[PDB]
Amino acid sequence: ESLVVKFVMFFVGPIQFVMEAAAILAAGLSDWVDFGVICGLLMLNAGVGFVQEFQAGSIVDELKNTAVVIRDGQLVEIPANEVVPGDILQLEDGTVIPTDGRIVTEDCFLQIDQSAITGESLAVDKHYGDQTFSSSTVKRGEGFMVVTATGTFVGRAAALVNKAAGGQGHFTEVLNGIGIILLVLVIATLLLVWTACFYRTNGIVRILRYTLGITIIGVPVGLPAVVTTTMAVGAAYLAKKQAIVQKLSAIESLAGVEILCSDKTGTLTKNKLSLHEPYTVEGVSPDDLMLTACLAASRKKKGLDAIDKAFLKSLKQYPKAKDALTKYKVLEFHPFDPVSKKVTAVVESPEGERIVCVKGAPLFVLKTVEEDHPIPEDVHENYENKVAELASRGFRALGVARKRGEGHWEILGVMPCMDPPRDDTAQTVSEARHLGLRVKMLTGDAVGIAKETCRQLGLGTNIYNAERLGLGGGSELADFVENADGFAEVFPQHKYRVVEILQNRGYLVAMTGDGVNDAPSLKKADTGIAVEGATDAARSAADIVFLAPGLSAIIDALKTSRQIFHRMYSYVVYRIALSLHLEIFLGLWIAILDNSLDIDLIVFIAIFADVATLAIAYDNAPYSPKPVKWNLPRLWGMSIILGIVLAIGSWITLTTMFLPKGGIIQNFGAMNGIMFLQISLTENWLIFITRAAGPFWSSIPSWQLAGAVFAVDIIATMFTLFGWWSENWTDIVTVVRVWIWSIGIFCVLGGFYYEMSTSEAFDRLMNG
Template sequence: MERQVIGTDEARGMAVDDLCRVLSSRRDGLAQSEANDRIQRFGYNELPEKEENAVKKFLRYFWGPIAWMIEAALVISAVIGRWEDFAIILVLLLTNAIVGFWQERQAGNAIAMLKKRLALEARVLRDGRWQEVAARDLVPGDIVRVRNGDIVPADIKLVEGDFLSADESALTGESMPVEKHVSDIAYSGSTVKQGEMTALVAATGDATFFGRTARLAGEAETVSHFQKAVVRIGDYLIVLAIALVTIVFIVSLVRHESILETLQFALVLIVAAIPAAMPAVLSITMAVGATALARKEAIVSRLVAIEEMAGVDVLCTDKTGTITENRLTLAEVVPFGGFEKGDVLFAALLASREEDRDPIDVAIIESKEGQALKEPLRSFTVTGFKPFDPVVKHTEATVRSADGREFRVAKGAPQVILALAGGGENLAEAVDRLSGAFAKKGYRMLGVARSDTPGAWAYAGVLGLHDPPRDDSAATIKTAADMGLDVKMVTGDHTAIAREVAREVNLRTEIATADAFVKESDPRAAEIVEKAAGFAEVFPEHKYRIVSLLQSRGHIVGMTGDGVNDAPALKKADVGIAVAGATDAAKSAAAIVLTKPGSR
């Protein structure tokens, strides 16, 4: 396959027309024949999966220092005709291989069942008309259309439409939806939360941001401490056995003893020196542990993770979706002027639409306070609704009460609502002050206004929204700390949000950003990473380096996560744990996959 014409990073900085020219594309789309040709050149829009041969996988269990010595004993038993010994040694060797292979295969099958692979469809402009095609058939240069609820099928450059709100939490760790406009890039795997736009496919398959992250995960090969310990034991025993056998042969030669008797004695020494049953016993023990974990809804895909878990002393945990719920909720209501909290929330509810499934609207409607006002809302009728507009940056509703009175409500960015309502310097100062206070808490601030007469708006108050910690997060972190684990939170979110979440779950609040260590030499960077309680504003390669630096300081590192952005670090960690609801990339990279929500 050819390398794709351009990467996402280059496409981001190019004008739409320039990118069209580079990709030999047109605004009216590609012809089907062109698309077929590009599939042949660049491949399908999917990540190549390496399927290891089952026979090779099985034969791996016969490779290694201890296995070699057992196999040597097997050969000597056959040569001298000790068939009882031959049978016992063979059974032990096969038991180790069969148990290990079976457990690994069972785990692989369970994870495959967990992967709810959607046969994604994409709306594409081909041969001058819009049509539905399989997302895997998209090629660079295609013109596609994405709308509310769609999973973005490739890395695309937005070329037409008002705006798009995309949830990129699985890719970047950002818990808030990101607003996109013409010429912005929307990444493969992100979810459209609002809006509808036409876009140009810039990169597909492993050339996408998602694909590059998956490649990094593939490069993160690591040998466990347990495997290293077994190899060390094996090396020591091999040296001991060879030394003893050498001495036996020298003595036998000097004393002119029978070669057959010498081989028999060598066999006894090898069998005595090598714990032939050890691999089988270890495999069976770990398989029993894996089965016990499976009953607790944790699937083990790499058996050595069972042993590694016992030695973990640093646990790096992703914030969004692991410590927190990855769901916006209403945290605080602050009224202004003569308004009450209930008035502010009532206006915000009327300016929200449940059917749009916008995360902010859902947070307001599904809040405890919002549900309490559900019945009173029935006596009001929304006669007109203006959805969020990226130009005016607020939603607006015209409402009629049961007695026929009409009024308007609006919600949006605090400064936008301030400009709409006015209110003088005192109100502006109050909004600024609250904005700073909410930012320190990691809240997203929303302004609410009401107008009872045409053209006269009053600033009713503000709402604070945040992604709350899971109910069990604080208790789980305390349990981990009591067991001697140093828990470090890692997130792509802003530092203020990370500090507030750390405070809520009783973690230390010394949060470092990627800038604090990314340009430092390894020894200095390792020192910074070791001392920090958590990390904010990090990318996948930073998470990978955090794990790597901690390992370089002698730590056995566990890592939990659920997104594509966590996959490289999950693979690099000594024990990678994908939490419930994790993406396929995270599940594939992890050694343990949790199927029950929460972190306990």
């Protein structure tokens, strides 16, 4: 696969295709210097792309079952590879399930945890004949299951992920889109020079030499190399903040995203049950009432029920784990039952005080003794009204009580619990709303339990069932999903469709997921985000995996994601103008004059425009508070003008050399050398205007970029002085004339770009 994914990188994208057209043309012309550079630089685009994809691919691979069966009537243990579907398997407590199964016959009912794949943090009591899902963990009981199919939400995940990944990316779309348009401008100026090269009868070798020189500059040879390098170097900063990208295009899409979809279970919540204390009943000991609950629980791994484990570390007392058993001397314990739904414990107290403490469902705790409390029907209504508040609050409800040895119960009260969101996810949402993107939540849990997490997070509490209005198989649908604050009870194929609506309306969408349910959606998503607790199908399908616990790393990731865009936005505005420069300038030079800057000097301009902007990746950039735009019609119009202003400036300089006595030549100079000196200085410094918001002096250039250009300007200066690949020599006095004149053109460019970039009108005029 590695050789296949590498060689498609050479092909894909219109910029790259014409390079083989350039490479064969230069090879056919026996100009092996031009053959080496583009073919050498084409490998560099792969070199940045392949090494990162291999290295980051190594990290996610570092992140990446046996069963008891009855075969021919005798019981053996076999791994999960050779189970043949449509056959009865015996699975017991605590196991991880290979495949889906139908429960055959059970006298007591199973409880398995569905948090891992489909996200339900409450263990579901499961009946005979029920649909069971793979990879779950059994928390209660014994059972026989007949399996349905081999790997199937795992099989559903793999099929949909393979179905997805079409539409290479938002970046590659605009990256191809610029590549097409520039190729049209290459054809537009090639026809102008081919018309002229026919009228003056020219040998085919001369015409192709002009054709070779234009196509090197017209389609940017370094743009696939630079822009991938710019996002790859930025991606290294992500790896230094514990965030790994798999395919690079997501990082710019993470800048351009303005809807974040979230899964409640793994991404938002700690998937460990916990209790809210301020939401407890009028019991006299608010804190001691949960201490009663820990008394009624098992203490070792046989009876560590999922809810019972939540109580043990819920205490604020420093010995929370040990405080439930400080010399209480448990005599006997009642295990949890399907029908009585209770756990009660007998403990011994000083002076021979046999006291008993219980846990259970609120209805079954309340009916231990009907008359034990005063006003028995009112305390009935008092908790049941509170449970009615509690059920509308989405909290799972558990009642506790206490009895004396002789057998009179005293009902302490009812206590709630749920899966709570992380501490940072309250804020990580909050400045995500500051950072310009609306957030939504997509979960397979119930609506009411998801409503609770909405107002805790402050989302808006406007969520809807997936099944009832998410389409089974629309513009009115588009309005609803966009206006929906979130969707609950969602299935994997609905989560993909929630994205499908938003992509069609034009939104860029990123979503966070751990389970295999939204792993199909992760591949579809513009930015696939995984968390520290992500499943293997998620981490394979996610474009970005978070190594750190919590979701707080996205704000770190998003801020530098927008910085990479402005680093790329500055370069792509810059690099199109250079092509549009030399397309006009060489196109007119060949048309009017049938001369051009020599083919050896043309390729050096392509390198120098490239290598100076290789340091763009290390340039400092500001992040926009709003989601970024990639406003292509303005980008093209701003690069239309700056290339012409360059084109006028180079045409002023060139025609001075036509005059007798030199014009711009003061003592002696080379007509090719001076213009290459002129062009390189004018092209290279164009990066300084574009890199800065508004005026070019607003932000100080980074030493990497500034050093890169200034070194390249020196190498540009040496070439014309000693006259390499050109006419013999140019004196220093002519050179300083070109430098000071190029500073004049540079200051002109600052005026135009500033008057374009901050102007509200030019954006409107170029859009329409």
